[PDB]
Structure formats: C-alpha cells, structure tokens
Assembly symmetry: D2
Homo-oligomer: 217 residues x 4
Amino acid sequence: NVIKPFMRFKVHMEGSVNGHEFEIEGEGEGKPYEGTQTAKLQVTKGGPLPFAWDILSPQFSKVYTKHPADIPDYKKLSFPEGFKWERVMNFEDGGVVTVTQDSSLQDGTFIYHVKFIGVNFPSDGPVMQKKTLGWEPSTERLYPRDGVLKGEIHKALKLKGGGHYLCEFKSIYMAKKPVKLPGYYYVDSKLDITSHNEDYTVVEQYERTEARHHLFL
Amino acid sequence: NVIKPFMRFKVHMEGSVNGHEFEIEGEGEGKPYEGTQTAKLQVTKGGPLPFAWDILSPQFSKVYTKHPADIPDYKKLSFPEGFKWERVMNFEDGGVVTVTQDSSLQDGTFIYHVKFIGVNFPSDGPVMQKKTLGWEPSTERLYPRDGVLKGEIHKALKLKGGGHYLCEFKSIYMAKKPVKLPGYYYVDSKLDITSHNEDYTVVEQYERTEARHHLFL
Amino acid sequence: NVIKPFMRFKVHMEGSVNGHEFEIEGEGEGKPYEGTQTAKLQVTKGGPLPFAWDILSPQFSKVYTKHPADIPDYKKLSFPEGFKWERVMNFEDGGVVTVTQDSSLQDGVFIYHVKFIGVNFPSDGPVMQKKTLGWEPSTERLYPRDGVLKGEIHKALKLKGGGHYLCEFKSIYMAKKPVKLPGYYYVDSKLDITSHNEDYTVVEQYERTEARHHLFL
Amino acid sequence: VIKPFMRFKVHMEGSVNGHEFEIEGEGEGKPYEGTQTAKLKVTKGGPLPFAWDILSPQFSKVYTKHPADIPDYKKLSFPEGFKWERVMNFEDGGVVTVTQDSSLQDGTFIYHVKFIGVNFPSDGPVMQKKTLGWEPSTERLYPRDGVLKGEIHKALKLKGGGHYLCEFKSIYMAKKPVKLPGYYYVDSKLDITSHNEDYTVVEQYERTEARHHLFL
C-alpha cells in the first residue's frame, strides 16, 4: 500500500570471514503483516564456505515483522524509499562482524544489498570448525535513539556436543526519509534452516518474527 | 516444602559508587510460586545517596519467580542451603558495576547479603545527576554453563527529558549444592519503585517475575 | 632479500560509514627497515566524504616497521607471498568498524586491498561532524596467538576545543605462508596528515613505526 | 609532603567467584624513583582458591617517576590524597571492579582496597592457578571529566606457554583540585619476588615510570 500482504525479495551479499571472500545470491518471499518468510540462497562465489553458515543466516528482512496496531512500524513506513540497516555482532570468543545493508523496493519486490566483514574467529572455534547447529529463538529489545531505531539481542548458536556459543547483536535501522518512531518494545524471532545441500552452497531458510510490548505491560 | 507459599526476607547491602561508600538495610516478602514480591529499604550509612537510587534497586530476590513445572526451578531447589549470585552491569557511558550476593534460609526467612562496587560514572551523567526515572520491564535470556546458571538482559532506565540510559546485565547463579539445571529460557521482570521519602533514604519496591519458554517454542 | 631498502606501494579502498559508501585510490613509498613511509590518497567515489578522514588514515602498511634483529619480523618474512590483516575498531561512543586487508608483492611494488565497514556512529558525534584533529602517537601490544600475530592499541583522536575521542584497536596479521612468530612485544607509531585539499578528497600521510621490547625488559 | 622514601600500609577486602577474603600488608619505596616493594598476608579466607596474580596490581602509583614537565597528579594530591578505581576485563569473561582510598597518615600512606571479581570459568587459568606473573605493561593516560584516566592491555603468562589477556581501565581521583596532565604513558613491571607455599604470604616489587611517547 505500498507494502502488500505478500511480497518477494532479491538479495545480493558480498562477504568476508577471516580473510576469505565470498558472494551469495538469493531470493525470498512472505507475509509482511504476519511476520513469516522464506529465502533460498546460493553461494555464487568463494564457495564452498570454510566456516559455519549460521553466522550468515541472520543477514538475509525485518520489513516482514508482525506489528500490533499501536507500535508504529518504522520499517514498513519507510517505503517506497525504504531503509538501511547496520549491525555489530560480538561473539563470546573474540569473533566480530560488522554488516551494512540497503533495503529498497522496485516494481513491488524488495531489493536487498548486503556487505559483511567478519574477523578474529579462532581457527579451532565453532565458527571455522563448523560445529554450530542453528540459532535458538531470540528476543530483541528496541527503542528510539538519535532519530533512528536501534535494537539488541542476546543470541545463541547450539553446539554439537551440546551447549551454546553466544553472540550479542546490536542493530541500527535507518529510514531513508522521515517516518514516525515507535517507543520501547520487543521483537521475537525464530530462524530455521529448512534445507541445504551437502556443502551449504545452496541453503533455504524460514523466519517467524513478531513485534509486541513487554508481557507485563 | 521448605519454601512456603508466603516467605519473608531480610537484606543487607554494603556498597560503593564513584568512591562514595554506603550501607543499606531492608526487608520484604511475597509469594515464591506466584513471582510477586515487595520490600522496604533504608539507607543506614552514607546517606543521602549522591547517585540515582535506580542502579541499586535490582540488587535487592529471584527465588520468587513463577516457574512452569517443565522448567526446573534451580534457585528454589537450592534451598534450604541456598545460592549465591554475582553480576556485571555495563552502562553505555562507561559505568561498570560488579555485585556479589549470598542467599540463605534462617528460621523460615530468606537472608540476603549484598556487596556492590560501581565505578566510572561520568560526573555529569544520569547516575550521578540523579536524572533517571525507573527501569523498563525487561527480559532475561538464561542457559546452563560451567555447571551453573547464567543469564543476560538488555535493560534501560528512563530519562528525565525522555530517552533511555542503557545497561547490560550479566548474572551468574550458583547453588550451594548440586541441583538440576534448566535449558535455554527467559525470565520477564518488572520492578517498580512504589514510594520513597524525599531524599531516597527509605524506598519501597515491588517486583513481578516469571520464567517461560520462548513464545515460538 | 625480496624486501628492499626502499619500496613503493599501491592501495585500493572500498569503504562504508553509516550507510554511506565510497572508494579511495592511492600510492605510497618508504623505507621498510627504517620504519618511515608516505602516501597520497584520492577519493574516487562517494566524495566529498561526510565523515572525519582520520578514521580512514590508519587503514592506508606495517611491513614498513623497524625491527631489532632479535624480534622476528613476521610481516617482512611473509613475502613475496605476503600477508592479510584484519581489525576491530571500537570507539567510546559506540561507533564500530571492521577492516579486512590483503597485502601482496607485484613486480617489486606492494599491492594493498582494503575493505572497511563502519557502523553506529552517532549523528552528532566527532566522527560524523568532522571534529577530529589527528591521532595521538600510540603503542601497540603484540603477541602470538592461534598461530598468527595479534596486537591491540588504546588510541585516541584529538578533539576541537580540547580533549580526546577514544578508540580501541584490535588487529590480526596472517602470513600467507608459515613464518617464525615473535613473542610478547610493542610497536610505537605516529601517523600525521602532512597535507590535504579543502574537502579531503586528496590527502597525504606520513607514518613513523618501530618495534621494540618493553623499556624495562 | 612526599619524601624520597615513604612507607605504606594496605588493607584489602575482596571476593572472587563468591569466595571472600581479607589481606593485610605493608610496603615501602622511593616515590620519585618509581620503585617499591610490599609484603602481603592473607588474614582471612585463605589459602586463596584462585591465582594470586589477579590481586597483585591492587596493592600504589604515587611511587611513579615523573619527568619535570609532566604534572604528577597523584603526588600533588597529598596530604589529602586520591582515590582510584578499576575495571579489569579478562578475555574469558572474568570481570573485576576495584575501589581504593589512598591517604597520608603521620608520614605513612594508608591504603584501603575493595575488590569484587566475578564470572571466572571454573576450568580457567584464574581458578585453576595456571598463571605465572604479569608481563611488563604500558598504560595510556589522559585527562577526562576533571580527573585522570588510563588504560592498559595486560597479559598474564601461562604454564604451557601463552598468554591470558586482560584490559585494565583506571580512574584516579584527587581529593582536592590539583593540576591535570595531558596525554602520556606509564611503563610498569610488577614481580612476585617471593611467596610461601600456598601464597598466604607474598612479596612484590614494582618499577614504574611516566613518560611522553618515544616519538614525541
């Protein structure tokens, strides 16, 4: 309206982990108002990836998040111009990533451009040894700051022997024009790898994602 | 069974913020299995406090948290012996607190000993200028690690002229005897300052707390 | 042997700060063994830059660092194959940067390729308001870890008026073939902007750089 | 104040991983030559179940050698004195805050220290006592918020070889207005000169000097 009850997107990423460059191409679709989507992703360059696909999986779409009527939907309101998002990921073993992303809309399909640099992963750690088994579901804490929208999450990857490998997300969401800002609130997400080929050069994903107030408010 | 539907506690804190020492005495009570409680705190030494009361309020009782029967209640199970808890608080402007606490059971009443060293608060910041107006409610991500329980929270204090002052909590919970650990889960909390005297040398608090799975699990 | 008493280098940077992309091209030269070098940089895309040049200056060459005989010069020994380096920069106001870099030798001229994503700079901060006036000289603490060379530095940019805007550097240096690693030691650096055009689309740099043991060793 | 040789006395109350302890000690040195020694006894909660090295830098930067062109903020603060505070961030999650009062009583420095260290892995170098002293270090200092601050990238040496890393952040606060320095460095080297078997008695020596950057 311009955001419709079902939209597709196209995604191009250029990325690096521990000096190893790579490029990924993909597409996706889902229900902006219900907060459900999928994506199919292809490692078009730099593959097969010598590290855990899981660290990339959350870089591939928060326009698709269900909102109640009283929490302004900053991300949907940014369109048709759209928004950019940027991120820091801090892993507990020193691994650090920054991400920068541009989200725009062309003939009613979203266009995603991602760049990703990851550094300081230990060579014997769960990322470069490929010991991660998916993300736990997560809860983001968001609020307005500095005229834009910010949010953070304590996330966790599951580990082969058991246990968790932890990572802190800090995100910034920046509309390409003035749009109404919401207050302090939460977004729940559960991202799954629904299927993949042997070496993870083709990967399909599913995310559920919904905004809400704190349950005691 | 040892933890009864209604339980009282007493609390003793010795603390320091920015070189300035203080003591606080208090008491409280509520319902361990419903996850509600209240408490009255009185500043016995080093009052009136030259910093925001808000940074101390969450150091005054997680034995009182509603658990569903499928989430092992580590803290309740630790009694009669009980548990210790420790914490890091990282404020966005450099302020850092560590906290160490002892929780025991004495004649049917909980005994709390707290010690608290906070450092690096800017002199013109919201803590030392007492510009804070209570915490948002909050959600803690917890998980087992290193034979004990740990949890983190992205918290925030409301700011006079509007805005938020952010603070990350990391907590560690240590039973004094072997007790069953839980898995990956959350805890919702809302702490309110229900009243206070003019210079915050006496303050009443109320907290609601509940353990649960992620909403999409 | 392959590293001569005087060498030139060429550098290509693709960067982004707070969603805003740019390219920079340049060439330099110095004396690898004396630890002195200059460079001239030109912004070829996304100019004039909407942020402080100073955050870019240290991404434009530690092969040019003086080394006593008793400290293995890992960077020099990596050649002719060369080495990659990577970096986290953590600014005190929440600005974060990751950098990834490739360093190779082509016809007796060093070739540098650099990518740079900076996120989460406050809109009114020293960086986006261009209020920085060069770096203090600095001392890096280095050591072998995980089969590569790592080093960290507490740096600071000078501010208009007085004062400092602080920045932690963490760096990883990865030789492209097996080379002898040094032990615990330091590197002193002083980087200067020797000249610049009106809008920092053309800028020249000088760095003096020396390795040494701690003065009391 | 400050005389060419002064004594100090120190009382520490600390906690690591929920285990409390008290320590008592005395020390002496040459405040203008930046050398000093100390002798510490664990008076309570010993033998300590964690590595002594995390405690050793909490036992005196008045004894640091200053060139004449860098204001000696800490010396100037007397007889009133200063306080100092610290955060220690260990690469494996261990965190400490430290708070300290330094005052001059009857020609002798009196030190009160409090220390809460938390979040050390049970299987890590601190709680398994696998450390072997600090590397020498270089601290970066500047004025900020009307006081003096400095930071350091420090490292404990490890049994099987290697390093256990720790960032220090210190705040030094004079009890009266005194002249602030600008941007400079402090080198230090702290040694454990002797200790009894289970570290209930320990002797340290530290050499410390302020300076500009070597290229300045």
